[PDB]
Amino acid sequence: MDQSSYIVDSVTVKNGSIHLYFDKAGQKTYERHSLSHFVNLDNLRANNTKGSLPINVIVFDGKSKCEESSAKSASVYYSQLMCQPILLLDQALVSDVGDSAEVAVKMFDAYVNTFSSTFNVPMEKLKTLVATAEAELAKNVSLDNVLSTFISAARQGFVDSDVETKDVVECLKLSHQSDIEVTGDSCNNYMLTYNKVENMTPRDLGACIDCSARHINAQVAKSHNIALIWNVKDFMSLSEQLRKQIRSAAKKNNLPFKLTCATTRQVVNVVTTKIALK
Ligand SMILES: [Cl-]
Ligand SMILES: [Cl-]
Numbered sequence: 001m002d003q004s005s006y007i008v009d010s011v012t013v014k015n016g017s018i019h020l021y022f023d024k025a026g027q028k029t030y031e032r033h034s035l036s037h038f039v040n041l042d043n044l045r046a047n048n049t050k051g052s053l054p055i056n057v058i059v060f061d062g063k064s065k066c067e068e069s070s071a072k073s074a075s076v077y078y079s080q081l082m083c084q085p086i087l088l089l090d091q092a093l094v095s096d097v098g099d100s101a102e103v104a105v106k107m108f109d110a111y112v113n114t115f116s117s118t119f120n121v122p123m124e125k126l127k128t129l130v131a132t133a134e135a136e137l138a139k140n141v142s143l144d145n146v147l148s149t150f151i152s153a154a155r156q157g158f159v160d161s162d163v164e165t166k167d168v169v170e171c172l173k174l175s176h177q178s179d180i181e182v183t184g185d186s187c188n189n190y191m192l193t194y195n196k197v198e199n200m201t202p203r204d205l206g207a208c209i210d211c212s213a214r215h216i217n218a219q220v221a222k223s224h225n226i227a228l229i230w231n232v233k234d235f236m237s238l239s240e241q242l243r244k245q246i247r248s249a250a251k252k253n254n255l256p257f258k259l260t261c262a263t264t265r266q267v268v269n270v271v272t273t274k275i276a277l278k
Pocket of ligand 1: 152
């Protein structure tokens with residue numbers, strides 16, 4: 001790491017996402033997050049509990065004395081806990097991101113784009129359903145209900161009957177939150193040997209065993225151009241920390257990471273160690 005925190009100079013909001021702009025050695029840069037995190041601002045204010053952060057951002061009061069300094073200091077801990085610089089966001093910059101309905105509506109649009117591109121749906125066979133969904137979002141109907149209803153009505157013909165609607169909902173939600181690629185393919189639940197059984201929580205080790213996750217070796221993967229593909233329910237059974245580490249180990253070795261809504265499994269076509277105890 002060069003710096004363990006960076007000051008957010010500006011923000012822009014578009015398509016249910018926010019871009020946080022900062023200077024990195026004289027180079028104007030940004031990181032992207034979903035707007036979801038920026039309605040309840042307090043999950044982002046550094047609390048007393050070590051906890052962890054949903055994303056690598058800390059919000060602070062710009063008028064307050066010692067709230068920036070406390071953030072900068074707290075973020076030399078958080079930067080090590082999550083292996084990312086922490087962006088320090090003056091809460092003044094994120095006062096007008098849209099209404100909680102305006103947010104719901106914009107995220108919903110991203111869910112639709114991902115759903116048609118993923119299952120190859122003509123955007124025109126959706127628009128009656130989309131119009132209905134958006135109208136209910138403005139009546140404060142749960143985003144999570146609107147999406148589930150939309151999928152139940154749009155899936156027929158396009159989504160294999162052996163895929164549960166609730167696994168599609170959850171691919172879509174997670175795909176927009178962390179910008180993860182979504183496929184319908186069979187899962188392999190492979191993860192890189194980089195993440196070690198030894199330091200896993202019992203939840204983590206138990207959960208990997210439960211979905212028959214298997215360790216793969218970096219050069220074996222890079223050689224066979226092997227996508228790591230996780231069933232979304234099995235992926236979300238892991239700890240948030242572990243989920244990030246699996247994905248960052250993949251992106252460093254330039255291996256595509258995909259969530260799937262399928263519970264069918266890839267052929268074991270490669271040297272894989274399956275997870276177990278010692
Ligand atoms: Cl329904
Ligand atoms: Cl993320």
